[PDB]
Amino acid sequence: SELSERIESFVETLKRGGGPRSSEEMARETLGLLRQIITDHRWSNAGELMELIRREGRRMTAAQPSETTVGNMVRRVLKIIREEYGRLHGQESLHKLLTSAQLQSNIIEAINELLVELEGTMENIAAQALEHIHSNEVIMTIGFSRTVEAFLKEAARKRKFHVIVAECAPFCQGHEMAVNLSKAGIETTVMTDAAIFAVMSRVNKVIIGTKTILANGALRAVTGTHTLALAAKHHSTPLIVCAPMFKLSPQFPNEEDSFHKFVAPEEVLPFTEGDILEKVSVHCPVFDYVPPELITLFISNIGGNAPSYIYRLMSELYHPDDHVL
Amino acid sequence: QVPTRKDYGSKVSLFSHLPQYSRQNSLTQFMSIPSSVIHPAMVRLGLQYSQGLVSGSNARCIALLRALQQVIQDYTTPPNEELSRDLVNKLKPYMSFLTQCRPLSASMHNAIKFLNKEITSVGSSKREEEAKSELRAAIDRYVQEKIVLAAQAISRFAYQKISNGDVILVYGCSSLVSRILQEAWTEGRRFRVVVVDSRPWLEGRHTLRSLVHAGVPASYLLIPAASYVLPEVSKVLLGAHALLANGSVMSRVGTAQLALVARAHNVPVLVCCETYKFCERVQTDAFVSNELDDPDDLQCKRGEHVALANWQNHASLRLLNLVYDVTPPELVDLVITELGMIPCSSVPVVLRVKSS
Amino acid sequence: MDDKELIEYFKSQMKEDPDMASAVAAIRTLLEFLKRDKGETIQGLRANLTSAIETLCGVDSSVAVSSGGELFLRFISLASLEYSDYSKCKKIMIERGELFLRRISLSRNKIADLCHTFIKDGATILTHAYSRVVLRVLEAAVAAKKRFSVYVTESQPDLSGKKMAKALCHLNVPVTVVLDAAVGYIMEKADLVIVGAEGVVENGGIINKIGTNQMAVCAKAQNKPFYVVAESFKFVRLFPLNQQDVPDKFKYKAEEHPWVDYTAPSLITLLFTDLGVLTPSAVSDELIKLYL
Amino acid sequence: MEFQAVVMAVLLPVGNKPLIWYPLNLLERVGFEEVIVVTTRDVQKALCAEFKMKMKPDIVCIPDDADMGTADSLRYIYPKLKTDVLVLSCDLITDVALHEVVDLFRAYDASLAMLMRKGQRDFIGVDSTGKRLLFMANEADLDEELVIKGSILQKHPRIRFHTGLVDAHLYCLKKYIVDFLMENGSITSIRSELIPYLVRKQFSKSLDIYSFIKEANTLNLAPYDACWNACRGDRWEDLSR
Amino acid sequence: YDLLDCHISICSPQVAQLFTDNFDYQTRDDFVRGLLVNEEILGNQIHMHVTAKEYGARVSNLHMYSAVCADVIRRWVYPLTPEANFTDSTTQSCTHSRHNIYRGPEVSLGHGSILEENVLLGSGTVIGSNCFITNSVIGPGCHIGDNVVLDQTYLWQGVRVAAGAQIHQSLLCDNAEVKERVTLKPRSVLTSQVVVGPNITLPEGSVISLHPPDAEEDEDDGEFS
């Protein structure tokens, strides 16, 4: 009842406009909502609970497939029920092929500790940040993302370096990073996207955030990230991606081409142009697809990793059956 | 003498050697209204350059040549002097002032060199009126053969490559590309055009206004989304502001990005440029020779707040506004000139044959 | 003189000397037709000559024939440039054609006497199809008492590779026939890949046998040197942007089986023409200089 | 040379220092080695002789007829005109950096540049940027409704209107404007008819008209109150000069 | 003059009182003009808010209907989108592709047909062979023949079109039908199950309906009487 109306409000907020802007807020709200779902709805066996979770997660994902934090948090919860059921009652590999009613409290405590560990991902990333920045380095970022801004603005407490931020047109939110970071004395620079390659030779390394990392190591980021990665590969400069663990989602690029997110073309082309708006077709995607071959490293709350290892993290977070959801 | 334009705002350390002025600060505030340095063919062109009333390289060259035609017409020799040298010695301050208003381009450099050579070639025995008339005629012939006939020949050449049912990608406001596409569409070619624009000038809309006025189907998008649209793109066609002896292409900031992503997507790249735009000087990057425009154009109004409003009050904050960049030759597959369809590596060869 | 007689003249010139290049025979046919034409106007010469050019191109769809015809017509224009009178023009046409024919006859030996210096003793030679120029340069290298291994592909459409293998065994040279799909597997054992060219495009890329492009790409992947040999008259004012852009009049008639591929100049180390050893830019320079 | 400074007078050397001296000095503040002044003849065609007692850098004076407006004065003085002109009035006390106004005449290659100030009856309407004026009229020729054409709104859909603004009677004008003035004798005064005629003629290779807005000073108008205000402010104005 | 009337107003109960006092007022424009002509008495200043980053319009005629449909298909009113399914109904589920090609469930595109751009297909539609549909909207459950050309048209639910027809800029209401060898000129209208007979080309301004007098022509199996 009350939980149902809260779920409906959450779905409507996702459909219209994200209230809690930070992805961490999305993860915390999704986990809390799943907590009241588990506590309130009645179930005898784990199967009906799993299918109810499948239905609710399907509804929430269908509300807005552009962002996948809700989806992979739901998948993590489903794996939590699977693990708890296997523990209280009793991974695909060649070894497997050759060889061969009180869990509610355990589920609740698992979700609680998941929230506790999710709280400190930013702090862990900041703690390990200092080992990848040396004095008088040149760093370039794209758009706005709180992870990398915390990264740099804490790693500059003991080091001095230069930072270049390219505005992510049309949503010129790189200016926000520039202002916030220059309010910490970092000697930053504000730049357009069209100049990326023009300056890319004189950059030591490039650190970027992301919105979602796929299974193959390819990621979905803000528009223009693919061009930056291509320039990096051309100049062979290392590329660092700062992404917490919950931004890892088990889908794959070729899925119905509902991958990008197209917004109103008002930002790209103002409505004041007039007559020419009929014969002209305008596209304003907000996300770009970066292949895994252009990525050098992954920094998460657990440490450093290579893209070629990303698949393993998939097996430790999501059961293969719950990919389709 | 003419004063020196004050540099506005702090600059990036890597770009400390380049000047950076502001559109608000006009040098004419420190010059006589009845121009006493020399006749005011200076100030009209200098103001239209500094304020950005004329942007196209061909437009800049044509305006400069018209202004210098007026200079020659109004010029008179001083007694006990030779025209062939006094004219150039007097013309050098015009170039200094024009550079102060806004740095010159390769096309204008070539025009100045050509006119200086023409003035030097003028004999010391011929009469004043004959010399002035022949200088004006030489300027007219240069304009004709180096712009109009060159554009027509380049359009005829490009008509071969443009096939039916393909997609052609352009960039920015370039007169040559727009004329090529319009003439190709005139001859019955049926195709689409994809327009890529970039902040802060946003001059790409210009060519869009042309394309609809020519009835050509078109599409418009910003530069960062180019990687999204290239898979359905069949050809990329770019205008160039200059060609260097090493085969590199000096052009607007986004040109190199488009070339690199097109190569990464396996798409042929065409560069259309006139022979007179070829420059002998060479460079390997955009840092050694560029031009920093007014950084105040970078400010944008998102929502109800401008993030970069008081950027001057942050000591650590820096803004750069590049206007030019260098595309390496290995990413260029064509140079389309009146001489024909050549590879980039043959750019110096043209410089050899047109020099004599 | 009629088109048929031209056709049998061309075919007989081909058959009498199997070693003669196709473009050489085409140029000889054009010169003979000019020798017996009884025309009076240079424009009348140009129309008949170009019409015979398309006639021979229909007879033989090779790029070399079209390149030779274009070179011949440019030679006609060059001869007529500074001769207002027509009889003096015609005599100069004949004499310069004789000189041109003898020079292109000696061109193959000129290429051979220059190309063989790059064959390191004990190295491995890789070749695609039956090209007479590479055979001649291998003969020159053998004459210098050098030892080398040779691999040749089979050129699946018509097995000219086996014919080249026979012609090389005739010279007592260690040669091995390999499948067209094994080039990569052989690319590791090679030291330098020399190949003939059907034709040369503006920037230095080569129009050649269909299997050349993949071999060039594989060699570039292994960073092995890649040398192409061709004569001067094989130059042409064409410029494809990719394999699709090649005109269909050269691909076929020589499901889908094109006989021709295009190789970009970025994958070519050097060219060996009678003018000398050339970078790919030199071809574009020569074409620019020829046409004013 | 392409500007020929022209001073209108149809005045009286009133004040602490002669009135006509105040604008003329401005001309010598920025170049303008030579200047043409036109005097009145209804009172006496000899005020030039009285003005010849000043100490300006260089002066040229020309008498006129008894009845002659500003446009009539230009019609008389045309044979001495060879290029673009800069018409001023004797009654004008301001410290404007003139280089702004001519910039509008310079950069945009306009056919007319004027100076207009925030006064402290006649309506003007400029575009959004506040440089190119688009409409102008007076309540004398308007009964109750102000009329705007459709075409001007098609080309400019946002017009900003000003009411209490005061003219400084300073105009940079092209030569063909003077030639057109020659072609038609129906024009008698510049402000009264000539400027609105051009403004309307901008919309039938076109006509460009620009006005620069100031916020510092006006001209010494005919009313004695304006003269008193000018006298009060003259000490502050001359403190810098 | 650059403003567009979105027909959106923020009002006070004073508006209701003024309406219930001023009997003659009938429309919003009448109220605005009456208040702006009755200035000194009950001053009641009217204020304005202008937006330039969001979309708002009011459809009032076929011109505005076509303009609004074209804008909506082109995502001008985001988040409102045909594939967004803001009304949670099963039928309006859609998938978004390149060139704004919106496809519903069970469309079954025929061989050789081409959807060029800005095309929305209702669920249950059937498309023939070598069809060319551009800048148009097709309602659910429609049926289209072979070699049909549709440009800037709008087909509601249940519309049936025979093969070989050419349709430009017209509107076809629900359950309408068109026979073979029929060409529709721009701005044509077909309403409420009117079937156009074979071998006819309607003029430019062609509005037809079952009701005799209002429609310029009324018929059920032809266009000639």
Please give a structural write-up:
This is part of a larger assembly, with chains A (325 residues), B (356 residues), C (292 residues), D (241 residues) and E (225 residues). Chain B has 356 residues and is an alpha/beta fold. Chain B has two domains: 1-153, no CATH class; 154-356, no CATH class. Helix content of chain B is 40%, strand content 12%. Chain B is built from ten helices and eleven strands. Chain C is 51% helix and 13% strand. Chain C has helices at 3-16, 22-35, 42-59, 63-81, 86-115, 132-143, 160-169, 183-187, 212-222, 248-251, 280-290; strands at residues 124-127, 149-153, 175-178, 192-196, 199-200, 206-209, 226-229, 260-263, 270-273, 276-278. In chain C, strands 3-2-1-4-7-9-10 form a seven-stranded mixed sheet, sandwiched between helices. In chain C, strands 5-6-8 form a three-stranded antiparallel sheet. With 225 residues, chain E is an alpha/beta fold. The longest helix of chain E is centred in the N-terminal third of the chain and has 12 residues, at 62-73. The chains are: A alpha/beta (325), B alpha/beta (356), C alpha/beta (292), D alpha/beta (241), E alpha/beta (225). Chains A and B meet through α9, β3, α10, α11 and β8 of A and α7, β3, α8, α9 and β8 of B. Chain B: Belongs to the eIF-2B alpha/beta/delta subunits family. Chain B: One of its GO terms (cellular component) is cytosol. Chain B: Keywords: Acetylation, Cytoplasm, Disease variant, Initiation factor, Leukodystrophy, Phosphoprotein, Protein biosynthesis.
Q: Give me the CATH fold name of the largest domain in chain C.
A: Rossmann fold
**How big a fraction of the residues of chain E is strand?**
15-25%
How many E-type strands of chain C? 10
* Order of H and E elements of chain E: HHHEEEEEEEEEEEEEEEEEE
The N- and C-terminal alpha carbons of chain E lie at a distance of 46 Å
For the record, what is the CATH homologous superfamily label of the largest domain in chain C? Translation initiation factor eif-2b, domain 2
Please report the number of helical segments of chain C.
Answer: 11
**Total discrete domains of chain C:** 2
Cα-to-Cα separation, first versus last residue of chain C: 33 Å
CA-based gyration radius of chain E: 22 Å
Shape of chain E: globular
**Helix proportion of residues of chain C, in percent?**
40-55%
- What structural category arises from helix and sheet content of chain C? alpha/beta
Compute the number of strand runs of chain E. 18
Q: Give the C-alpha Rg of chain C.
A: 20 Å
Numbering strands along the chain, what is their spatial order in the largest sheet of chain E? 1-2-4-6-9-12-15-18
What order do the strands of the largest sheet of chain C run in, or round the barrel if closed? 3-2-1-4-7-9-10
What is the CATH first-level class name of the largest domain in chain C? Alpha Beta
Order of helices and strands of chain C: HHHHHEHEHEHEEEHEHEEEH
